[PDB]
Design a protein around this ligand. Sequence first.
Ligand SMILES: CCC[C@@H](C)[C@H]1CC[C@H]2[C@@H]3[C@H](O)C[C@@H]4C[C@H](O)CC[C@]4(C)[C@H]3C[C@H](O)[C@]12C
Ligand SMILES: CCC[C@@H](C)[C@H]1CC[C@H]2[C@@H]3[C@H](O)C[C@@H]4C[C@H](O)CC[C@]4(C)[C@H]3C[C@H](O)[C@]12C
Ligand SMILES: [Mg+2]
Ligand SMILES: [Zn+2]
Ligand SMILES: [Zn+2]
Lengths: 1336, 47, 513
Amino acid sequence: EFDAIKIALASPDMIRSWSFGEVKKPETINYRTFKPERDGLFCARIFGPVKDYECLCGKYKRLKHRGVICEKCGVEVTQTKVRRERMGHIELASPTAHIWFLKSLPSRIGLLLDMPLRDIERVLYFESYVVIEGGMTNLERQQILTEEQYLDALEEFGDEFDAKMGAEAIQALLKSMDLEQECEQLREELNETNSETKRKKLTKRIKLLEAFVQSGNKPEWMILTVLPVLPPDLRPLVPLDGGRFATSDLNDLYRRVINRNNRLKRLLDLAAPDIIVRNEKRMLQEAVDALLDNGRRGRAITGSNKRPLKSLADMIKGKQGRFRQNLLGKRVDYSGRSVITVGPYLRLHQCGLPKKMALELFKPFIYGKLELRGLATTIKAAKKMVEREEAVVWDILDEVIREHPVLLNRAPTLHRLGIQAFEPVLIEGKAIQLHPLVCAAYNADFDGDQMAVHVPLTLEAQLEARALMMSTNNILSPANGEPIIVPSQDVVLGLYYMTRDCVNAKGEGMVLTGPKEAERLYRSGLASLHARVKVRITEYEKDANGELVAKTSLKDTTVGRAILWMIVPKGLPYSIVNQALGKKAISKMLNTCYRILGLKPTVIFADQIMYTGFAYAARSGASVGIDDMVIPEKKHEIISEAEAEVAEIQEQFQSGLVTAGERYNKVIDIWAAANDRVSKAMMDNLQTETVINRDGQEEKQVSFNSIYMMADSGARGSAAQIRQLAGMRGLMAKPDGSIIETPITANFREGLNVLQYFISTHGARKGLADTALKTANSGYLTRRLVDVAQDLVVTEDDCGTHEGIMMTPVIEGGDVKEPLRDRVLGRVTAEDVLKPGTADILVPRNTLLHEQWCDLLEENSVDAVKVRSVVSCDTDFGVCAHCYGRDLARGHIINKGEAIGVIAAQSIGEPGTQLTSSIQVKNKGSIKLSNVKSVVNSSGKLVITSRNTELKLIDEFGRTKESYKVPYGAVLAKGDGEQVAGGETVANWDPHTMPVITEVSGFVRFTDMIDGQTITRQTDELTGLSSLVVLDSAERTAGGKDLRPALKIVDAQGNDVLIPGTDMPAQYFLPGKAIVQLEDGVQISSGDTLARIPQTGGLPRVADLFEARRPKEPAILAEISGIVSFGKETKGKRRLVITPVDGSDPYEEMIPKWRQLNVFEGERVERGDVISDGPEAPHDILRLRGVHAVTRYIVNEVQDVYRLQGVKINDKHIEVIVRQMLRKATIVNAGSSDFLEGEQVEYSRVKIANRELEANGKVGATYSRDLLGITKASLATESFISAASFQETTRVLTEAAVAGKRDELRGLKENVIVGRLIPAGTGYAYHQDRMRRRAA
Amino acid sequence: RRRKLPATIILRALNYTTEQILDLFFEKVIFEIKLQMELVPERLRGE
Amino acid sequence: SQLKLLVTRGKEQGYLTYAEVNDHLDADDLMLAENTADEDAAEAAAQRTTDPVRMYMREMGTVELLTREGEIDIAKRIEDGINQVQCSVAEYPEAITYLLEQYDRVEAEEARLSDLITGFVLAREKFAELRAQYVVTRDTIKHATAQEEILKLSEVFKQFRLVPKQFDYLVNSMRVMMDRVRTQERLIMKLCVEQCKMPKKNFITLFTGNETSDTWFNAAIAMNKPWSEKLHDVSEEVHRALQKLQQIEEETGLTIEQVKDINRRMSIGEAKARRAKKEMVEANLRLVISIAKKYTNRGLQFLDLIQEGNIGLMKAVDKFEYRRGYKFSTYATWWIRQAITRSIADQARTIRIPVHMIETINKLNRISRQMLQEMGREPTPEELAERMLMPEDKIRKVLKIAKEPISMETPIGDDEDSHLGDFIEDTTLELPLDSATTESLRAATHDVLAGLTAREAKVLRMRFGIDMNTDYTLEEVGKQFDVTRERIRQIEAKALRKLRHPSRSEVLRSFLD
Ligand SMILES: CCC[C@@H](C)[C@H]1CC[C@H]2[C@@H]3[C@H](O)C[C@@H]4C[C@H](O)CC[C@]4(C)[C@H]3C[C@H](O)[C@]12C
Ligand SMILES: CCC[C@@H](C)[C@H]1CC[C@H]2[C@@H]3[C@H](O)C[C@@H]4C[C@H](O)CC[C@]4(C)[C@H]3C[C@H](O)[C@]12C
Ligand SMILES: [Mg+2]
Ligand SMILES: [Zn+2]
Ligand SMILES: [Zn+2]
């Protein structure tokens, strides 16, 4: 209807235009007749009649004569709702400053006038005068003149002198101000001499003057002359039961403003002393300030209840304002709630709805049906029929409900599966029956939880619920590809018990004809559910283009597996059910069914699995008793032995042989070992049993114990819970985080005594508090993540880009913890996947890698692919479907319009509550060295001559399996190009002192070495050797301080030995605190040690890693490639200069001397190398290394937090957030564009700006990408309606008003506030068509 | 819990002179004249 | 400096404590704390009490109290002022004529004799003497001896004392007459000087000294100067202004320079009165603030009380005389108390209560307190009426006053910070089922009314405003149908009878109830 919203400042003429009349009296209503007063806050003349079509007096009280203004009253005869739309105005006697434009942090008034805020405040409060265009009389504009100074200046000046006080002075200043001429003057200033901040401040001044000139506002509009009055019905005075009333706080504030204004107007007629009028004007300013914003400049005015009054500003901001409490979430019609029960008889797509709730929610539909079918004549008859609950009413209700989805929702909606659409089934009672398989999606248990039910109304809403939100459409998690409809705890136990063989059961050794005979035998009592038999099984294979060829063969199975085979669909093999079928086997089975067959067979299969599991779990009759918790028979011996060892340690400490800090650890280790022994003994005794037999001999088998069965199948429990039940409760902690030495040696089968229970309580209280805190934090993280990345939408099919990420498996030193299949499945290749033999292309390009392609890649053993990624997408304002991948919840390539930002935010935030030397090879392969320079030492072996050496174990198949990091100068047993066996330590080194080593051998002379200037005399008394320890710069004398210890290599012939392969002299400038051991003239072998130089986690790690915080001590990277050099020393921090090979060297950094540098001044380093060592910074990687390196550092550094806790989410969702982090570009060269040199612009704008410009006959502009946090990157929103929702409302509206900003609703958070279709999903087509017609 | 003030102020507010304050909170050593000092063995724990 | 250290500490730690900020630093403290939180930049880093009451106290402080004699001088000053203006206005002729005409009208029983005049320095006799003097002086304007006659007339006029209202009316009338003269003079000056650059010297030489004839302007047009030639274009407006001035001269009967001097003396006296009054009030501000501290918790804020007290003092200082000898602190406290009490009774509660009802409520409260203390338990409305002499219905009515409205934000949820305003429903909205019922009734009426002869349908739609813009009577529909108010009634009755019986109107019966 409008398609855009504009905001600006209001002129007094505009304010008089809005109003329908002036409010002159502070009266509200008569205390006797309760009628609106005349010219008061509630006035019928100004704001409209109080009841529909009726004058106040009553002479005109019918619709027939509407639109007429009664002469007696003046009240127009119209609808009363018009009182909700009409404003008034109050003409202030004297101008008042607007608090938003005075006490804002930038202080718009002061910024525009170029005056300190304190000067403005003191002139406002009638403290000192101000000269306004004084003239040529030796006065300076905007000069403070206190009362005495003003008085003595007035003398000797017959001129007016133009001095004023109060807000009138400010208004005169603003009105006299000229913006174009001052902008010209500032341009002249910027043209001339420039200083560090002079140029910046002048540029800011000119830019903001230009902005204010272009906004269309005028400065003097910041000073109020007329005050608008809100319509009465938004600040109502409403009668409550009895003689009492309730009123809004705005009535009090308006009454105060009007009282003081009228008093001032009266006072200005009496010609009162200036003291009185000054005080009155100060009070008027204070009252208007309190009205517009109460509690911002001074003390908040309070009411009778002694609480601060709510002002106009308080009604907009906060979590209880119109922007948040009512515009983004509000109460809804056609809704209900109730407690949820099980209902295990249901199908996956339907729920159970009480008849009473269904009758109440669908009332209009039932009225329509009753009238249509002729049962009722009018709607009143239908109402009475439904109110009496006749017989026909229930048939009509059953007809209405037939195919009408209802949305069920549970209160903590953490992801999109917390709302799902089901088909109702009318039931008796008052509880909602919820299908078991969906509980995990809701995180719902049946111990008192409640659910809300909403009913879609429109045809479009019903179709969306049926096609998008149905429960049979969401069976895969959207965070990863895994199903979320897995059977949970009792289905698992039933299917485990059914498929679980026994050694010598009834009917063992039989040969059945198929599943039917197996079931017929079991059900008639002739065979046991686990009796090993031979069964003829017929299974189908898709060994063709979908043909399902059959194969019949005699399998060796049990009766349970043969029975369970009856429910498995055609395409699957028989080996899926031919096992014990724990918790994870069932999930694998469902995943296999989904990938091979499709969606419908999977849903049918899941329902059959649930039914069979429940039936046979009931059949088994599995229970829990006190004899199932078998305590080990050796527990007392183990505890006694631990007691003896700890007592011996204590008495040894009492003899002063060990420090307490070590005996504590010894006792802790003793008790840990004892606990491990007890747990091992318990589990050994509890997981096996002896049975007999086919012939009569003792034979072991896995136990049928009930606790063990529950833990082993994954139904419920673990080894820790069993350990506490039958082992020992373990080792408790303390409030300080310490671990109390003596553990709880009792389990729960045995009782705890009072002290052990006291310690347990210590633990439990902390557990509860930590749970609460985690739930608190994980919501804030999700809210920020949604705010930053809400408006991302797939808005293209292919951008055509040829770039992407390089996906390879993740290896933490030893084993691999994420194969290539997990990281590559479902993505789009950016380049041909050449065969590892380099023969031909294996996967051409732009091919969505589904399961078959992943299997092919695994078969050919490729370990590196190039996959298109979101962070390297060429689409402007959105993403393309090919650079994203596939949906992960539907299984196909993502659809256009899908909102991927909200999905990414929800997927990242949903699991938040859950989360809290020598090198030895391990496999028979071949050593491969990457990024290392080799050389042969004196011993003849190979020594590393590099800092970034990487060792890989390339097996006979050419696949990496072990990646290891080796420091500098390590002796290697083997090298590249030689096969090795297992268990061979191919590298070793000393992890102590310093790795400073030489490179050649020969006579060493102390060149440029003077005793008493750089070294100290410290002879090795123990060995008798003389060692020259190099002191520091401070201690040493200045005679040779600038000199450094250089040890040149020479021969016996008197010549000079230089670095082999080059003419560079071989000198080693050793640093301070270096212990020179070998004397001059003593030949040294290659690599000799010249000097023995001495020396978070959980959610907060993720939250501080999306905020791009800089660590405490960031490792210094190589800013530029070139020879490293040094400059002036000890100028607060050690100075280092890098000189490129040819390029200029304007780089110099004050590197602190505290950092232990790992590079010598004679060693060149390229950019991106580490100078110091420590945690890396996120900003430095982006600058030194491309975008693909900072994203790789993040998607791997936050995925480590989740992997530890077992949470798995796709990498798609972390690259969506990163794409929104590095979104602003900083320009370095303007080029032929229209961009300022030092400016930050949206990277999308600059990318397209120079793109079209380059195509023409111009040259594009360079830039440097920038990285922000999710909280700083969400403040760059270009709409002031979405920004005010989650930012400071006062700041956003104050800056948008002066700038004359207008925003066209283009986001998801703005069309919700306005109340129109979002541009993301089903509303994507509507918005595109609107833009097309609008362009025309 | 208002703006911080040096502690000794309050002592002066209780009508205490500087000599009295030092007497209360500190011990003293003496000297005699030439330039002879009365040594207390316990005091010189580190010297 | 000190702020810089606190900022450095906050940046290093990212947070600060109240003690650290307060030490390193009421309204000024709050302002500084707000500024510090700005960073969590340049403006805050670079960056009295702001209380309107403290600044008022400061501005009042620079004052000197007055001793017993310190008022007397001021008092006499005031008298001189007023006396001067009296002598300034005694010379105005039209004033005495207006006084006599008003007195004659009063004698015509249009107003009370005493209301006209507050006595003199007997009323009928003094009026007769005044009339005799006026008649003997007006008929002797002949210049040589007329001045002494007018002086005697004014001197005898001095013996009279005039009501402030009519004296101020005469002053305002003289002021508006002088304003008209000055406006005409300013128009002449603007049309002659700015439009023609007419030198001020010529204006002084010609305009001043006579200021009655047209020689100063009309005869100066032939001075042989460019301004004289240019005055031809604007001669019409200047001539009209001169004619108005000549007409006014007849009313004034005096030289305009004398009028200017009289007005100058009047302004000097008024300024003296004003300065004296200001000096008096500045001293008495302390008394005003001292009185107005017994009404703190009454609905008005302290400063409003102070300002109302200041109005009462300014009224007293104008109505105070030193003849009685009341130490101001006794003639002034009464006015201050009156003003403060009336203001509290006029602008202290949102639903205004008249003054008399406020007094009744206060009296009832005092009686209730006395009764509660005396009898011990409580007074009941019957006992209150007996002790208070009221019909026992007025007592109940006064007790039923609506007290004070509840703030609509009073936290009442106590569970989710809910406010009292969230639980108040809109009682005027029409239920969606009633709207559907209305539409269904309209449809049923449209269906039924089509089942009778077109004339009957038209008549029924004409009488009852069914889909019509407005209702109509019998004679109007007769004008429409060319019949006279009788056949129309018969056809209407026939149609209603036809719709009356069932088989034609049964769903309407369903709508009925
Ligand atoms: C902390 C929540 C306070 C809130 C629950 C308390 C505080 C004052 C109470 C109201 C007032 O008495 C005025 C009315 C008196 C009538 O008799 C009954 C209604 C009425 C609104 C009262 C209901 C309730 O009791 C109130 C709102
Ligand atoms: C624990 C929270 C109490 C809350 C549920 C109860 C306690 C007092 C109740 C209000 C007061 O009576 C005043 C009004 C009376 C009108 O008749 C209906 C509205 C009105 C606001 C009442 C609605 C509600 O019922 C209130 C808030
Ligand atoms: Mg629960
Ligand atoms: Zn009226
Ligand atoms: Zn793309």
